[PDB]
């Protein structure tokens, strides 16, 4: 909790929020990111699979706030019908589409239109590895709209047996609520890391500071492996920045 | 003859710790006995 | 000890080297063992010796 | 090297070290009577050969692992072993008594008896008696008074066999050790009920029971009853 106590963190956030108001070029910048300089190489190849960091104290977003796109295994008749009928998930998804239909309908410039319309993309884990070919480069560089893996039902796969295909609406809604409130990170085989911690004009400075400490604790705690505890050997320095603002230091070793 | 003095009942009883100390090395520790007990049941059954 | 052995063992009693090699390498096994030198086996000829 | 250490009961050792086993000194060194592993250790240094005692093969050894308080079998004591099927356990009993003591091995079935005789030649202190234990009067000549009576006979009327032998060849305040198989006596009822009856029958025969021990996991449905023969 030393980071929150340190005044350096508060002043930088005050400077960052203020100068976004002042500078026109940063007018479209809305999210707050922290840049973490790990001492040693993580050694994890970037799998493009988001890793959720639980933020206990505060919730970044709710499902009702964001455009959510669900990509399902073909055929989507069962999942679309079950989700659209159940009251809990009736109004949860902006659009439900299958992989084959997504590939056929959207190509080229249409992929850019899909990128803008949707704030969050979620996909069945079975079809996640196919998406990089389909969605294109734009979704898969930068990590702003990187798809999230979700599981339709609590059924499990057993070798030499066929999984029963079912859709559990309450489980899907529960996963999506967790995805929105909890921030996410992607491992890479280099020191630098970027994690979203706050949203300008929604989160106060004390809340963003708490989110940062939650991120640091989860990422450093070896007990939380394999999802957490990826930052071995401590953190050399931590910065704060928006998408187009530079790194303002908040901690240095 | 059961004529032990207060000191006699101390030196002899020190030996009890001394030799029993030697045996606990052979006796092996509690944690491993937890695994050994599980392995023993599987083999015996 | 010999009395408690089945008849199959007595047939191949003296050819353990060839038997266990063949068993482990999935090849054909011996068929005479030490009994090959019995007079009756000598009288037989061809495949009849194994029988 | 393996650190053989003394045991509570004289004539018994444990080859403590890495592989710790119950162990007895070999009377006739250089050979094993049923292929048991043999350990030799130099002691000031002269090597003394030792034999492994397998509890799963001998019920008496299962008693040692169970922690029997008192064993009347000890060096320099005469022992009467009833139900000596072979030299599997009698040889170890011969080891414990040592050259000074003697073991009276009693067997009925002829086929294991011939195995017993071939072993007795190696061990001078073992006197093999091939006769029915139900009629002790037949072999009274070959047996002197005995400090302890050990019985592994698996017969329904075993308590009578112990009484006749104990009344005859057991010294006053002598030893009585019995291994009981409840399945032979009564399979319908649980083992504890059967053992209670056997203790009662011994008491009627002027044998005071001292302790009782179940032999699990070495054997299922078995226990060893240790008593003292109080003629008075």
């Amino acid at each position: 909790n030393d980071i929150i106590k340190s005044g350096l963190a508060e002043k930088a956030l005050k400077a960052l929020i203020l100068q976004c108001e002042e500078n026109p070029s940063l007018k479209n910048d809305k999210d707050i990111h922290i840049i973490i300089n790990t001492g040693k190489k993580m050694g994890i190849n970037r799998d493009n699979i988001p890793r959720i960091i639980p933020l206990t104290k505060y919730k970044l977003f709710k499902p009702r706030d964001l455009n959510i796109l669900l990509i399902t295994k073909d055929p989507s008749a069962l999942y679309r019908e079950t989700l659209t009928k159940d009251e809990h998930t009736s109004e949860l998804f902006k659009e439900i589409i299958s992989v084959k239909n997504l590939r056929r309908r959207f190509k080229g410039s249409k992929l850019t239109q899909l990128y803008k319309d949707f704030d969050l993309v979620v996909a069945d884990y079975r079809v996640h590895h196919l998406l990089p070919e389909v969605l294109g480069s734009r979704f898969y560089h930068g990590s702003k709209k990187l798809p999230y893996m979700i599981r339709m039902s609590k059924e499990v796969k057993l070798k030499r047996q066929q999984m029963v295909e079912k859709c559990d609406p309450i489980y899907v809604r529960a996963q999506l609520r967790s995805i929105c409130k909890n921030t996410s990170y992607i491992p890479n085989n280099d020191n630098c890391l970027s994690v979203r911690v706050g949203y300008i004009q929604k989160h106060s400075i004390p809340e963003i500071l708490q989110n940062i400490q939650d991120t640091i604790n989860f990422l450093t705690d070896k007990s939380k492996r394999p999802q957490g505890g990826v930052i071995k050997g401590g953190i050399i320095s931590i910065f704060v920045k928006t998408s187009n603002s530079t790194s303002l230091p908040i901690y240095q070793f | 003859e059961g004529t032990l003095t207060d000191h006699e009942r101390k030196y002899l009883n020190k030996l009890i710790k001394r030799n029993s100390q030697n045996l606990r090395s052979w006796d092996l520790e509690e944690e491993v006995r937890d695994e050994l007990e599980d392995i023993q049941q599987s083999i015996l059954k | 000890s010999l009395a408690k052995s089945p008849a199959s063992t007595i047939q191949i009693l003296g050819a353990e080297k060839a038997l266990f090699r063949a068993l482990k390498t999935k090849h054909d096994t011996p068929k005479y063992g030490l009994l090959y030198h019995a007079s009756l086996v000598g009288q037989a000829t061809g495949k009849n010796k194994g029988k | 090297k393996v650190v053989i250490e003394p045991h509570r009961h004289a004539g018994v050792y444990i080859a403590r070290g890495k592989e710790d086993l119950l162990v007895t000194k070999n009377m006739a060194p250089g050979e094993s009577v049923y292929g048991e592993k043999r350990i030799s250790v130099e002691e000031p240094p002269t090597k003394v050969e030792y034999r492994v005692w397998n509890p799963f093969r001998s019920k008496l050894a299962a008693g040692i692992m169970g922690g029997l308080d008192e064993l009347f079998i000890a060096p320099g004591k005469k022992v009467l072993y009833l139900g000596a099927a072979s030299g599997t356990s009698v040889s170890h009993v011969s080891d414990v008594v040592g050259p000074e003591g003697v073991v009276y091995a009693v067997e009925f079935s002829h086929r294991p008896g011939r195995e017993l005789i071939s072993m007795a030649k190696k061990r001078p202190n073992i006197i093999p008696i091939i006769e029915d234990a139900r009629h002790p009067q037949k072999y009274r000549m070959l047996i002197g008074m005995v400090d302890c009576v050990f019985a592994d006979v698996a017969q329904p009327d075993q308590a009578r066999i112990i009484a006749l032998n104990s009344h005859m060849f057991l010294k006053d305040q002598g030893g009585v050790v019995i291994s009981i198989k409840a399945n032979c006596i009564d399979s319908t009822v649980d083992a504890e009920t059967v053992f209670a009856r056997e203790v009662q029958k011994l008491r009627e025969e002027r044998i005071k029971p001292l302790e009782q021990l179940t032999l699990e996991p070495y054997e299922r449905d078995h226990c060893i009853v240790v008593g003292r023969y109080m003629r008075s």
Binding site: - | - | - | I14, E19, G66, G67, P209
Partner: protein, 139 residues
């Protein structure tokens, strides 16, 4: 037939290895040990340490309970871990034996189908398949 021969030979070796190893190992006894006392008072005042005349921690050792009068260079942890290894090793022999046993049984069942006779395939609700042979005497 040769496959059945090969696996059985492997299974026989594992069984013998298991028998030799288990003899080397020593198993701690787990059995009730009752003591008989003639007087009710002797029971109530009974104490294991007094009866065995030994220290309380010394009492709980069934294999070697040494009375006080009798009481009167390798690291232990390395010895302890290596002891666990031997106990695991005999268990691994047992697991290999059962696996070879199951493998042999399935091969033997297949061989019975190759032999002459009239057989009907019966399938249970669980999906297990078995063959029931007609009641015909062999000529």
């Amino acid at each position: 037939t040769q496959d059945s021969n090969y696996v059985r030979t492997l299974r026989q070796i594992e069984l013998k290895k298991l028998e030799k190893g288990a003899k080397q190992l020593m198993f701690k006894s787990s059995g009730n040990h009752t003591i008989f006392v003639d007087s009710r008072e002797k029971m109530n005042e009974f104490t294991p340490e007094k009866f065995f005349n030994t220290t309380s921690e010394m009492v709980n050792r069934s294999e070697n309970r040494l009375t006080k009068d009798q009481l009167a260079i390798m690291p232990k942890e390395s010895l302890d871990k290596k002891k666990l290894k031997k106990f695991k090793q005999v268990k691994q022999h047992l697991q290999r034996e059962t696996q070879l046993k199951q493998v042999q049984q399935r091969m033997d069942a297949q061989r019975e189908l190759l032999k002459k006779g009239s057989k009907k395939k019966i399938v249970d609700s669980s999906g297990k398949i078995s063959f029931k042979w007609k009641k015909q005497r062999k000529r």
